């Protein structure tokens, strides 16, 4: 007796406010509410040895890879930069 | 920085409602904030007037708002219904009452007058006693 | 807001005129006048579609965004900022302006002794918006480029299908028709290489633009949180001058904030101690 | 006056600016160094490829050269776009602080 | 200690309020000397 229904979404319970040029609403009681809020601060540091990944333990492959210029160095530098930025994030968040 | 090491007046930045304080907590690759906030709960209706004209002059609340339950007028703080007698200490005068739209008539109690009247009654009793010898 | 507020039928706002930012029922959608001008001022394809490039409709249709904007504006005008922090509390709009003036360090009496004037300026001020947005077109440029770029890249992504990338012919059907399998492969694979580089570039550009738009949308959400649902003491955040209040308005792929602010006008010299 | 002592003595204080410059220079320098790699072609200088090889056989090495160099510019442009986004974030923070 | 202070009178609202009472008291005394 359960089924998949499709419908126009409801924006919220309509609530007309009794506005008046001389009417005021003032609370006589309060609630102290605690709300949780989750925020990512960092991510797992990763390092990829470009030569090891592309040409694992093969010198014939490394000879061809070295013809491609500084691509592997650029990738390694980018990943080390990300790794350093992770610790910088953690320091600036938690070490106040 | 704003929510934990202090209190933020920014609306809906440190949790919903009027922010009171906050708690940081660690989490796997992240942080969890417990925002402790004040939220008004039970509102009541009142008849309000932007000003009060008592001695020809207009009166405005130093802090809060004017309210009336239909029979008496009080001044109360904005976010909590704590009515108090309209006194010269709680209000300030600004001009007369012909230009303010929506001003209403209500007496403004001045705490100095009862003290002076008690002193005057004491003085009158002392005079009457002095007429006896 | 979890609640959709409705403006009261009577419009006794103490002289303040919101008929230009509130929705009007004459329109089949609940848009206001300024929002309706904004949707016309921004120009919001098949040949893109047949190559596998599909545009998806937004989750919230413009009618729902207009409803949300109307609810926010009604809450702002009938309850001040109290509807953002919790239960919605009705309050006369003149008293709300007195609250705002008290917020900016001006004693509230200054409002009441000048209310008829302050309305007449504000009612005129909103009117100046109508003249401003209807005459000049570059004002909404902040949105137009956001459209054009997304179009332009798409067009470029289509144009990349016309390149040879070293193959003898730029049409895959032509390659299949003229060449046998072993020799057709050496052209087809070049075609995949080039077109896959093209999609790599397009997806990277889209990711970067999406990050920029996410930053801008987070800024817009922040401005909605403080400027609209409250009053911001941050200097030059919610408009120029001492911020008083704000109005959100929808627009094609964007939001328009009308920041109503207090600006001192005529000053006199005095000797101070 | 203490600032006068702080900035004039140590140099790492302005590091948050220096790393902005150096990276760009490095991002340029590597982009220049990419012109020295063969990318599989028999010679790195395109003039050598044109001089030693006829217009039929030269094309296969030249195409390798364009492939490699265009990939290099694509990487450089992507890195520049990401760095420009970061600098825009820092500039917006600076504008807010102002 | 304050630099730039200037001389000016500061009006206390209690002084005239008490001075009116003083004049009323003086008139009452003078009237009491009449019978």
């Amino acid at each position: 007796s359960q089924s998949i229904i499709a419908y126009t979404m409801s924006l919220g319970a309509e609530n007309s406010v009794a506005y008046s040029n001389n009417s005021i609403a003032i609370p006589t009681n309060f609630t102290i509410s605690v709300t949780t809020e989750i925020l990512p601060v960092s991510m797992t540091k990763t390092s990829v040895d470009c030569t090891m990944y592309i040409c694992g333990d093969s010198t014939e492959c490394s000879n061809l890879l070295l013809q491609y210029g500084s691509f592997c160095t650029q990738l390694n530098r980018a990943l080390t930069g990300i790794a350093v930025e992770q610790d910088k994030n953690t320091q600036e968040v938690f070490a106040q | 920085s704003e929510c934990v090491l202090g209190q933020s007046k920014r609306v809906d930045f440190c949790g919903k409602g009027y922010h009171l304080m906050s708690f940081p907590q660690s989490a796997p690759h992240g942080v969890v904030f417990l925002h402790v906030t004040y939220v008004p709960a039970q509102e009541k209706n009142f008849t309000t007037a932007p000003a009060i004209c008592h001695d020809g002059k207009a009166h405005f609340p130093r802090e809060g708002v004017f309210v009336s339950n239909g029979t008496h007028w009080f001044v109360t703080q904005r976010n909590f219904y704590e009515p108090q007698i309209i006194t010269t200490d709680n209000t300030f005068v600004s001009g007369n009452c012909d230009v303010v739209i929506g001003i209403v008539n209500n007496t403004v109690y001045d705490p100095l007058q009862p003290e002076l009247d008690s002193f005057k009654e004491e003085l009158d009793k002392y005079f009457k006693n002095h007429t006896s010898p | 807001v979890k609640q959709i507020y409705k403006t009261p039928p009577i419009k006794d706002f103490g002289g303040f005129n919101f008929s230009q930012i509130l929705p009007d029922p004459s329109k089949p959608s609940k848009r206001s006048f300024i929002e309706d001008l904004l949707f016309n001022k921004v120009t919001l394809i098949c040949a893109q579609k047949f190559n596998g490039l599909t545009v998806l409709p937004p989750l919230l249709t413009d009618e729902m965004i207009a409803q949300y904007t109307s609810a926010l504006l009604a809450g702002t005008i009938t309850s001040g900022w109290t509807f953002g922090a919790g239960a919605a509390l009705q309050i006369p709009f003149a008293m709300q302006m007195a609250y705002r003036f008290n917020g900016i360090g001006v004693t509230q009496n200054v409002l009441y002794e000048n209310q008829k004037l302050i309305a007449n300026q504000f009612n005129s001020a909103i009117g100046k918006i109508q003249d401003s947005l209807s005459s000049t077109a570059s004002a909404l440029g902040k949105l137009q480029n956001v459209v054009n770029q997304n179009a332009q890249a798409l067009n470029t992504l289509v144009k990349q299908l016309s390149s040879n990338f070293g193959a003898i012919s730029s049409v895959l059907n032509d390659i299949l028709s003229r060449l046998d399998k072993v020799e057709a492969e050496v052209q087809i694979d070049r075609l995949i290489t080039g077109r896959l580089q093209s999609l790599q570039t397009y997806v990277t550009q889209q990711l970067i633009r999406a990050a920029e738009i996410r930053a801008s949308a987070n800024l817009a959400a922040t401005k909605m949180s403080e400027c609209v649902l409250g009053q911001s003491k941050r200097v030059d955040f919610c408009g120029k001058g001492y911020h008083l209040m704000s109005f959100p308005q929808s627009a094609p792929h964007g939001v328009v904030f009308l920041h109503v602010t207090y600006v001192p006008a005529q000053e006199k010299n005095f000797t101070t101690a």
Side-chain angles (χ1 to χ4, degrees), chain A, chain B, chain C:
Chain A
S1 62
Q2 302 216 84
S3 61
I4 289 160
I5 62 170
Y7 52 90
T8 301
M9 88 176 268
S10 62
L11 303 172
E14 184 274 297
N15 188 341
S16 186
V17 169
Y19 172 87
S20 294
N21 60 2
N22 66 341
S23 175
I24 189 81
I26 293 172
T28 187
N29 210 1
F30 49 76
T31 57
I32 309 300
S33 178
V34 298
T35 64
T36 185
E37 183 178 1
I38 295 91
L39 297 173
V41 164
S42 62
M43 54 179 256
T44 60
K45 305 178 172 179
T46 176
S47 280
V48 179
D49 283 278
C50 179
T51 298
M52 186 66 204
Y53 173 87
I54 292 142
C55 290
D57 215 316
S58 168
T59 187
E60 295 86 334
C61 196
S62 299
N63 292 122
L64 288 166
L65 170 73
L66 71 83
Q67 293 180 356
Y68 264 86
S70 194
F71 277 131
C72 286
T73 297
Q74 291 202 264
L75 305 188
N76 214 357
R77 291 185 309 184
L79 288 181
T80 61
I82 293 172
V84 168
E85 284 294 331
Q86 301 318 299
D87 291 331
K88 185 183 101 203
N89 284 6
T90 309
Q91 287 284 348
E92 74 202 82
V93 175
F94 282 111
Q96 309 273 289
Chain B
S1 297
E2 267 83 356
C3 318
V4 188
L5 272 69
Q7 185 190 21
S8 186
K9 303 301 297 285
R10 307 172 64 182
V11 176
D12 287 336
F13 187 61
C14 312
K16 273 203 60 83
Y18 307 107
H19 181 240
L20 286 176
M21 77 182 260
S22 305
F23 301 121
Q25 302 288 271
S26 180
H29 297 302
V31 65
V32 169
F33 286 96
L34 312 180
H35 305 300
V36 185
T37 71
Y38 171 106
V39 178
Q42 292 176 308
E43 63 272 1
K44 286 177 68 175
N45 292 334
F46 303 94
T47 298
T48 186
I52 302 280
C53 181
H54 164 54
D55 296 331
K57 293 164 290 292
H59 294 243
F60 308 81
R62 279 191 172 95
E63 65 183 1
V65 76
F66 286 127
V67 288
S68 66
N69 66 354
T71 62
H72 296 75
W73 283 92
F74 313 106
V75 183
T76 183
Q77 70 195 311
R78 309 184 196 279
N79 295 341
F80 193 83
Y81 175 66
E82 182 206 60
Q84 296 194 351
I85 307 300
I86 303 169
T87 186
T88 308
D89 189 359
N90 207 17
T91 186
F92 69 91
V93 182
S94 176
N96 82 79
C97 57
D98 58 46
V99 69
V100 181
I101 295 91
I103 190 163
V104 304
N105 277 336
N106 194 85
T107 182
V108 173
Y109 184 111
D110 43 359
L112 177 141
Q113 282 305 109
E115 308 299 331
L116 259 61
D117 288 347
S118 61
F119 206 71
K120 182 259 289 180
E121 289 311 312
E122 173 191 336
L123 175 65
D124 202 307
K125 275 195 171 188
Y126 271 43
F127 271 131
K128 293 293 199 300
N129 186 43
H130 198 199
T131 66
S132 71
Chain C
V1 287
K2 278 76 64 162
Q3 309 273 307
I4 298 295
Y5 297 96
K6 183 161 32 67
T7 300
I10 187 66
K11 302 296 169 64
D12 49 329
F13 293 130
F16 295 77
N17 188 334
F18 300 117
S19 67
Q20 204 143 10
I21 61 182
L22 283 164
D24 46 356
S26 66
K27 182 71 173 66
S29 70
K30 297 186 175 72
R31 290 177 181 169
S32 82
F33 182 76
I34 291 165
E35 311 172 46
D36 203 329
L37 195 152
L38 299 166
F39 292 102
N40 286 347
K41 289 289 298 303
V42 166
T43 62
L44 178 47
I45 298 314
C46 281
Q48 301 171 1
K49 198 170 188 291
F50 303 81
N51 311 128
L53 283 72
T54 57
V55 61
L56 269 52
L59 192 155
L60 292 89
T61 44
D62 284 89
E63 174 42 41
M64 281 155 218
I65 291 149
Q67 277 194 250
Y68 269 132
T69 296
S70 170
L72 284 163
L73 200 154
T76 302
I77 62 170
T78 60
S79 54
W81 62 88
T82 63
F83 87 99
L89 273 49
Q90 69 274 16
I91 180 163
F93 190 82
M95 302 216 58
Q96 165 175 343
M97 210 45 58
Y99 276 39
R100 306 307 183 96
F101 281 171
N102 204 306
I104 68 161
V106 176
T107 60
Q108 65 183 177
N109 69 315
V110 177
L111 170 80
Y112 296 128
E113 295 179 1
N114 304 276
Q115 177 182 336
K116 278 181 53 65
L117 174 60
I118 297 169
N120 283 355
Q121 295 188 46
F122 168 65
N123 296 341
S124 301
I126 293 287
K128 282 178 54 61
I129 288 293
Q130 173 263 290
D131 299 354
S132 182
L133 294 179
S134 179
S135 298
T136 184
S138 178
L140 271 76
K142 280 282 294 295
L143 297 174
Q144 185 66 86
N145 69 305
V146 176
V147 179
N148 295 349
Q149 305 214 320
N150 310 318
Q152 183 143 23
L154 283 170
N155 288 0
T156 297
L157 184 60
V158 184
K159 270 305 205 179
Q160 283 314 141
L161 298 177
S162 192
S163 305
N164 297 311
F165 296 103
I168 62 161
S169 182
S170 54
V171 176
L172 183 63
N173 296 306
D174 188 358
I175 298 313
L176 294 174
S177 303
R178 280 170 51 179
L179 295 177
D180 59 71
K181 300 294 187 291
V182 298
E183 293 179 353
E185 176 180 358
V186 75
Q187 314 302 325
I188 297 169
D189 60 29
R190 296 185 63 85
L191 286 185
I192 296 89
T193 301
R195 290 174 179 180
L196 192 45
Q197 261 189 33
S198 306
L199 282 178
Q200 273 314 330
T201 297
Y202 167 74
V203 168
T204 300
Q205 297 298 335
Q206 287 313 299
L207 283 167
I208 298 166
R209 300 179 197 271
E212 186 267 355
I213 295 292
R214 203 191 30 91
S216 191
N218 289 341
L219 173 63
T222 310
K223 292 212 179 213
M224 190 87 49
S225 294
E226 307 91 33
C227 319
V228 190
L229 277 73
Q231 182 190 20
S232 181
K233 303 300 297 287
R234 304 172 63 194
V235 176
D236 283 18
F237 186 63
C238 312
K240 214 76 70 185
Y242 305 108
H243 180 240
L244 287 174
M245 65 180 288
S246 307
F247 300 121
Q249 302 290 270
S250 60
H253 299 299
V255 64
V256 165
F257 286 95
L258 312 180
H259 304 301
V260 186
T261 69
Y262 170 105
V263 172
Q266 301 173 305
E267 64 270 15
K268 305 173 67 151
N269 292 325
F270 301 98
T271 299
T272 181

